[PDB]
Amino acid sequence: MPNYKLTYFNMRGRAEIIRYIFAYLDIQYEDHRIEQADWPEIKSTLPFGKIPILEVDGLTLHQSLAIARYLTKNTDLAGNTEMEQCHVDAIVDTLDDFMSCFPWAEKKQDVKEQMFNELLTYNAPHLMQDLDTYLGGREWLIGNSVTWADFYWEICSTTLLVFKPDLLDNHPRLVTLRKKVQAIPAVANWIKRRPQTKL
Amino acid sequence: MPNYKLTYFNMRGRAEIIRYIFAYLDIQYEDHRIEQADWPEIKSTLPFGKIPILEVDGLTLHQSLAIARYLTKNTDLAGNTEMEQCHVDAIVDTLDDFMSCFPWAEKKQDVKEQMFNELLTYNAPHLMQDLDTYLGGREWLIGNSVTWADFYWEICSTTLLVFKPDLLDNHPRLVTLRKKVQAIPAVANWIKRRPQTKL
Numbered sequence: 001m002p003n004y005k006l007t008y009f010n011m012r013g014r015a016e017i018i019r020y021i022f023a024y025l026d027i028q029y030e031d032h033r034i035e036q037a038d039w040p041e042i043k044s045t046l047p048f049g050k051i052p053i054l055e056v057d058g059l060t061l062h063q064s065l066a067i068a069r070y071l072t073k074n075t076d077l078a079g080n081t082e083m084e085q086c087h088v089d090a091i092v093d094t095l096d097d098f099m100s101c102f103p104w105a106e107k108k109q110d111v112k113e114q115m116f117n118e119l120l121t122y123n124a125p126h127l128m129q130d131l132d133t134y135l136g137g138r139e140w141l142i143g144n145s146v147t148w149a150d151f152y153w154e155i156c157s158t159t160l161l162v163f164k165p166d167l168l169d170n171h172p173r174l175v176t177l178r179k180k181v182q183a184i185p186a187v188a189n190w191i192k193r194r195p196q197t198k199l
Numbered sequence: 200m201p202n203y204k205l206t207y208f209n210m211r212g213r214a215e216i217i218r219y220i221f222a223y224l225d226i227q228y229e230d231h232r233i234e235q236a237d238w239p240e241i242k243s244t245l246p247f248g249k250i251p252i253l254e255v256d257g258l259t260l261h262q263s264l265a266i267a268r269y270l271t272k273n274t275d276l277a278g279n280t281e282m283e284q285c286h287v288d289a290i291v292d293t294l295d296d297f298m299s300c301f302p303w304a305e306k307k308q309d310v311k312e313q314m315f316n317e318l319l320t321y322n323a324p325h326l327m328q329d330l331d332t333y334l335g336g337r338e339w340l341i342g343n344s345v346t347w348a349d350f351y352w353e354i355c356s357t358t359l360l361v362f363k364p365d366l367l368d369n370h371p372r373l374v375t376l377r378k379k380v381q382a383i384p385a386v387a388n389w390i391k392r393r394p395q396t397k398l
């Protein structure tokens with residue numbers, strides 16, 4: 001069996017998709033969480049200076065979604081056909097594009113709060129509406145069963161709701177999708193034991 | 200055989216990776232390029248309001264890298280092992296993260312030029328150095344043969360060099376990698392017939 005070590009900050013953030021996948025597939029791993037103080041040292045040892053990274057039998061993988069895709073290959077989370085695997089990838093990237101717009105690392109709280117509130121007020125409702133229309137009356141975002149795109153929806157929406165609690169008031173179908181992901185036994189079991197962090 | 204129709208603006212931009220893949224695999228397709236004037240109408244018909252899109256026997260795929268990955272599955276461009284396929288994905292996303300930082304759509308030329316010059320002066324050299332160190336003395340970025348990560352390197356660097364011609368003066372190994380991609384017969388054949396656009 002592979003010996004997995006995940007390194008990230010002590011937060012859900014970009015590592016959480018990987019953590020959900022390990023939970024669903026019942027894979028034991030080391031969930032190494034670093035303090036901000038240790039980051040400068042660690043950063044200088046990494047080929048691209050970013051986390052998360054996943055060490056697999058000592059070899060270092062990077063890029064959260066590249067890693068997530070790797071872990072889901074030949075599993076029920078991948079997507080059931082080659083084109084549905086493309087749809088999974090496309091939804092994940094649509095979500096990731098938006099999350100990547102937020103100035104997470106910005107130091108000036110004034111401009112940071114202003115930019116968060118712009119994105120959440122003007123851009124977020126538009127994306128929520130497109131996702132809701134895309135989902136329509138289907139059970140899951142892609143195909144006839146849960147995929148890691150549904151996981152990423154729940155993760156991303158969980159963080160957006162911290163800043164904008166009314167985000168999904170006009171989207172009961174997207175709320176239902178969150179609840180369905182949160183109710184999957186392995187995911188529910190992870191949610192109830194994970195460290196509690198704002199982000 | 201699949202009937203492919205690619206829709207994008209009249210530019211290399213985000214569609215070019217797909218165009219290189221079709222060239223390499225010797226796949227005929229419709230390269231539909233829209234004028235800015237027609238975009239409002241077309242945009243309102245798309246599930247996520249963005250291009251490129253690829254219609255495959257009438258069914259619409261979106262997200263440039265999702266599409267690229269779909270087209271390279273079960274081909275020699277994918278990566279030779281499952282972990283090398285993860286490395287391909289990770290390099291592509293590292294490149295894409297940086298290209299996605301540029302305010303391509305910004306209307307105020309003053310702030311746009313300032314932001315381009317900040318990214319190109321302060322961030323670009325750092326990434327170039329990380330890529331150069333990652334490549335080291337290997338022939339290609341991943342494994343022992345060309346992958347679509349090498350294609351995306353060449354595409355992204357081609358556009359960066361428009362704005363910063365000295366970008367690779369300190370990176371002869373990255374220049375060599377560009378030339379090797381540009382010399383692949385099917386790619387060279389595409390480069391010599393493609394429409395000539397700034398971006």
Ligand SMILES: CC(C)(O)[C@H]1CC[C@H](NC(=O)c2cnc3cc(OC(F)F)ccc3c2)CC1
Binds near residue numbers: 009013014015099100
């Ligand atoms: C070291 C230094 C400067 O202090 C960092 C500042 C930025 C910090 N990052 C976040 O706060 C953060 C939180 N959540 C995210 C969720 C995302 O989407 C997810 F849902 F995948 C994507 C990116 C996210 C980034 C980490 C420390």
Ligand SMILES: CC(C)(O)[C@H]1CC[C@H](NC(=O)c2cnc3cc(OC(F)F)ccc3c2)CC1
Binds near residue numbers: 208210212213298354
């Ligand atoms: C309709 C409206 C407002 O006029 C648009 C403005 C922005 C326009 N987009 C670009 O100019 C452009 C060019 N190149 C790119 C290269 C990239 O990386 C690549 F190498 F894949 C990624 C994004 C890029 C975007 C398209 C029209």
Ligand SMILES: N[C@@H](CCC(=O)N[C@@H](CS)C(=O)NCC(=O)O)C(=O)O
Binds near residue numbers: 043049051063292
């Ligand atoms: N697209 C990459 C983004 C990685 C990234 O930028 N990570 C941030 C934290 S969320 C980071 O390492 N920031 C610290 C730094 O740049 O010093 C991924 O999904 O893995």
Ligand SMILES: N[C@@H](CCC(=O)N[C@@H](CS)C(=O)NCC(=O)O)C(=O)O
Binds near residue numbers: 212213248251261264
């Ligand atoms: N990550 C997406 C980005 C798609 C995207 O934002 N495309 C731009 C053009 S490069 C667009 O459609 N802009 C026009 C608009 O938003 O109205 C991809 O790679 O396909």
